[PDB]
Design a protein around this ligand. Structure first.
Ligand SMILES: NCCOc1ccccc1
Length: 147
């Protein structure tokens, strides 16, 4: 039927069908368009108190709750999708990953290198596509597949 991991859903507020991907957690109104050895991705990480290392270049002691970190992720996605802010801008300013200094870019990578939820989402993204909130032991990610 649909690309890997996509399913149909119905908006609770509008009644209009939409599409949701249970690997990348992306959601969109439009029907998804139509695997490589490597993909290249950027990300924006929001860490929380249960992160494997609750520390980042932004904050020596990350104290926020997982729920709070999810709200922040949700707000960044909203501004990216509205065009109010660019992914690269928000990643540089707010990602709890050292890759913030590279606008979130992680470089290219294969299967087996990254945390599994991140890897699965990265490879199920089409080139140019952005994930919804992706959960790993590091925190909550927004993932942008660039290659
Ligand atoms: N941050 C401004 C308020 O934006 C929203 C955006 C989407 C859903 C609910 C509230």
């Amino acid at each position: 039927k649909l690309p890997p991991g996509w399913e149909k859903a119905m908006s609770r507020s509008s009644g209009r069908v939409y599409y949701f991907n249970h690997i990348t957690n992306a959601s969109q109104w439009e029907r998804p368009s139509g695997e490589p050895a490597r993909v290249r991705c950027s990300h924006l990480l929001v860490k929380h108190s249960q992160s494997r290392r609750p520390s980042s270049w932004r904050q020596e002691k990350i104290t926020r709750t997982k729920e709070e970190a999810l709200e922040l992720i949700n707000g960044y996605i909203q501004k990216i999708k509205s065009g109010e802010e660019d992914f690269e801008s928000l990643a540089s300013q707010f990602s709890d990953c050292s890759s913030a200094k590279a606008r979130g870019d992680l470089g290219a990578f294969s299967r087996g290198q990254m945390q599994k939820p991140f890897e699965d989402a990265s490879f199920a993204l089409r080139t140019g596509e952005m994930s919804g909130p992706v959960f790993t032991d590091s925190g909550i990610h927004i993932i942008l597949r660039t290659e």
